[PDB]
Design a binder for this molecule. Structure first.
Ligand SMILES: CCCCCCCCCCCCCCCCC[C@@H](O)O[C@H](CO[C@H](O)CCCCCCCCCCCCCCC)COP(=O)(O)OCC[N+](C)(C)C
Lengths: 48, 95, 91, 486, 48
């Protein structure tokens, strides 16, 4: 059960760090997308 | 002492509800604080600002002697007032 | 540069002055809270009269009254209960 | 009116009224007796709910003693953690109960909020009602086991409890270790905005700070990829923990949300009124900020002790300025005088600080509070935080001790502001930290009580600032009375 | 000395609450408590 929700946070954070660990335009795109989802993350999970 | 207190209260009884008077606390507290703070920083302030002051001493005479063996000073010269030139700031800069 | 030959072991000066400060400050109160059993009397009046009475018998130079009144005053001191028995103010 | 009449008028008959303990014993007695006590305890409670050979024996017992003592230490620390857990639990358990009501909503899709509440007058800390099996087996099991998992859970609830402390920690550390223009300007403003209103200090501000962080990091990214040098942004480590600060702040929003918190003449007069509702209304916000009755617990003694510790920190930072960062003999101090004006200015300022803090404590007037915050911010910013501070050879090499002093003052200032939020100095009671009265507490207080000069300063200040019938003799005797009493 | 504590912090309490007679009242009580050792020991005998 901890895996489910806490891993949801984990996956979002880890994908963010994965984007930022190496220097790339692709990474910056991933980080910006991460913030975009991040702000609505509670809502996105809440929504269908 | 105790009779003195009784006598004073008999002829000088403070009215109830005054509680205290502000000015006298100003006075006593101020004197106490000034005395203690002054003593606390007196050595500190003295060494900070006043603290022995270096006075320049500049040789008023220089004597040089060249002597061989133990026979006789072959040379001896002493210069005191006009031949002792103090450094000017420009000369110090050159040095 | 040269200075007059004051300013030696100044930290000494500091430490001894501050400990002197400690001496005075503790002096004002060290155990004075112990000296709290003598200032509560409502009236030491009778003690006055008897002490000048011992002085009186002193000039009048009578034999037993002297040591008698000295012992009484000493007993008055011994018991606080006695310092307060009749010293309660006249009603 | 008898000001001193009562001193001698008193009657008498009416006057008369109508964990570590094992470590203690083991240091005192043979620890073998201590373990015999521990297991016989185990025996008693378990009943309640329902010499060469001797030489090897003592040594084996010693090994067991070490294991048992370590276990005891962890249990005691855990107890302290547990104490933290109860205050956090207040929130945790109320949330669990409401969650169960939600569970009922899932099983029964209907709508009545009050009815589900009825299964659980409208406001109570305690809500004793029906109880659902899963919850009880769950806590009973969790309670039953623990060797180090207790620590793990304790970490979980403590971290949830802290809520905002880490952001402070990160902000201070990042600027102190690296201080670019924004990295140094942003903290003072964030503290001031943060220490304003208890319900919501910053309506939208946290986001402004965080958005600044993403843009600045992006700037760093392009920076790796001229006039650019002019800006106070320099080549260095790619990152240290900014991502962690950002994630922590996001968690902060999530916790606030989970708990639940937000985040002709006609036209001319209308425009003037709108301008009033923006800026003069904001002034009124400050007024309500400064209005009476916000209630929080008051702990003056922690501030005073923190302050004295701050002086301790400052005084420690003296020899380091010299060529001797090791607290060497006094002779070097006598023979160096390496620009000592700063020491005197700082010490004078901190004493004035203590004086004013006590004055504010006794009279609780706002101007002193504001004076405190403004003076501290201007002093830190003007005195330090540019190239001139590096006048001493403390650019970054040993440039942490002054920073150590910096954060300590920062935490003190923040807690001081929290105290401003509570106010209420008039209502007082002994410091619960002091009121825990521990032998360690007793040692610390007595050590505070053995330092020179304390007596006169405390007595004189309180005497002037205490506003009742009082002679110097009576009050000073009372401090003596306190000394014997404690 | 527990009751002495409570009464001495009580005099402090009335100090901030700044009531008139209670102050000198409680100072005189504490002073009387000091005067008699018999009184220092009357009720200070530990709770049975
Ligand atoms: C650069 C140098 C600076 C000075 C350095 C030296 C400092 C010397 C300090 C000397 C302090 C003297 C204090 C004198 C206080 C007088 C207080 C008096 O005015 O009030 C009376 C209370 O004082 C008492 O009479 C004195 C009681 C003393 C009891 C304890 C005795 C201590 C043991 C013997 C003295 C030992 C001294 C040891 C150190 C010298 C009654 O007050 P009250 O009527 O309500 O109010 C009326 C309005 N007043 C106050 C303005 C008049």
């Amino acid at each position: 059960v901890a895996v489910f929700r806490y891993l949801f946070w984990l996956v979002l954070v880890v994908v963010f760090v994965a984007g930022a660990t190496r220097i790339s335009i692709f990474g910056l795109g991933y980080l910006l997308a991460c913030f975009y989802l991040l702000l609505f993350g509670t809502t996105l999970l809440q929504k269908d | 002492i105790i009779k003195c207190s009784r006598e004073t209260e008999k002829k000088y009884p403070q009215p109830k509800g005054q509680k205290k008077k502000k000015i006298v606390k100003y006075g006593m507290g101020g004197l106490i604080i000034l005395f203690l703070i002054a003593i606390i920083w007196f050595p500190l302030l003295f060494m900070s600002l006043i603290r022995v002051v270096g006075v320049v001493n500049q040789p008023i005479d220089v004597t040089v002697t060249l002597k061989l063996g133990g026979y006789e000073p072959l040379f001896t010269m002493s210069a005191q007032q006009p031949s002792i030139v103090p450094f000017t700031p420009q000369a110090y800069e050159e040095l | 540069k040269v200075s007059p030959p004051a300013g030696y072991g100044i930290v000494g000066l500091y430490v001894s002055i501050v400990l002197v400060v400690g001496k005075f400050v503790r002096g004002f109160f060290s155990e004075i809270s112990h000296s709290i059993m003598f200032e509560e009397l409502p009236c030491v009046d009778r003690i006055l009269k008897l002490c000048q009475d011992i002085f009186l018998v002193r000039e009048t130079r009578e034999l037993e009254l002297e040591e008698e009144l000295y012992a009484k005053l000493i007993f008055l001191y011994r018991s606080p209960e006695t310092m307060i028995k009749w010293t309660r103010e006249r009603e | 009116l008898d000001h001193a009449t009562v001193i001698h008028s008193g009657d008498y008959f009416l006057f008369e009224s109508d964990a570590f303990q094992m470590a203690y014993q083991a240091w005192v007695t043979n620890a073998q007796t201590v373990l015999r006590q521990r297991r016989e305890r185990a025996r008693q409670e378990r009943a309640e709910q329902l010499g060469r050979s001797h030489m090897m024996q003592r040594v084996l017992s010693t090994m067991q003693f070490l294991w048992v003592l370590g276990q005891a230490t962890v249990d005691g620390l855990t107890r302290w953690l547990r104490a933290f857990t109860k205050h956090h639990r207040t929130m945790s358990d109320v949330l669990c109960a409401e969650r169960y009501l939600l569970t009922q909503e899932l099983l029964r899709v209907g709508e009545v909020r009050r009815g589900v509440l009825d299964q659980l007058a409208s406001e109570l800390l305690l809500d004793r009602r029906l109880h659902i099996p899963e919850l009880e087996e769950a806590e009973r099991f969790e309670a039953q086991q623990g060797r180090t998992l207790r620590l793990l859970r304790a970490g979980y609830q403590c971290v949830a409890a802290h809520s905002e402390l880490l952001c402070y920690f990160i902000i201070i550390l990042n600027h102190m270790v690296t201080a670019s223009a924004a990295s140094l300007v942003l903290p003072v403003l964030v503290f001031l905005w943060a220490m304003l209103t208890i319900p919501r200090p910053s309506k939208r501000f946290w986001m402004t700070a965080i958005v600044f962080t993403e843009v600045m990091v992006v700037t760093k990214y392009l920076f790796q990829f001229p006039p650019r040098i002019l800006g106070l942004e320099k080549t260095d480590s790619y990152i240290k923990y900014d991502l962690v600060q950002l994630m922590a702040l996001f968690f902060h929003r999530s916790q606030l949300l989970c708990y639940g918190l937000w985040d002709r003449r006609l036209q001319s007069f209308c425009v003037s009124l709108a301008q009033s509702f923006y800026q003069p209304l904001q002034r009124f916000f400050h007024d309500i900020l400064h209005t009476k009755y916000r209630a929080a617990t008051d702990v003056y003694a922690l501030m005073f002790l923190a302050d004295i510790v701050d002086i301790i920190i400052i005084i420690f930072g003296f020899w380091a300025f010299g060529k001797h960062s090791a607290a060497t003999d006094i002779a070097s101090s006598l023979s160096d005088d390496q620009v000592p004006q700063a020491f005197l200015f700082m010490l004078l300022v901190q004493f004035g600080t203590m004086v004013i803090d006590r004055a504010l404590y006794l009279r609780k007037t706002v101007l002193g509070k504001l004076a405190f915050q403004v003076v501290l911010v201007v002093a830190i910013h003007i005195w330090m935080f540019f190239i001139l501070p590096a006048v001493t050879e403390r650019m970054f090499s040993q440039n942490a001790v002054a920073q150590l002093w910096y954060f300590v003052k920062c935490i003190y200032f923040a807690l001081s502001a929290y105290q401003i939020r509570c106010g209420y100095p008039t209502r007082i009671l002994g410091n619960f930290l002091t009121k825990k009265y521990n032998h360690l507490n007793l040692f610390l207080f007595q050590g505070f009580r053995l330092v020179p000069f304390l007596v006169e300063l405390r007595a004189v200040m309180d005497w002037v600032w205490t506003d009742t019938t009082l002679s110097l003799s009576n009050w000073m005797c009372v401090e003596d009375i306190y000394a014997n009493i404690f």
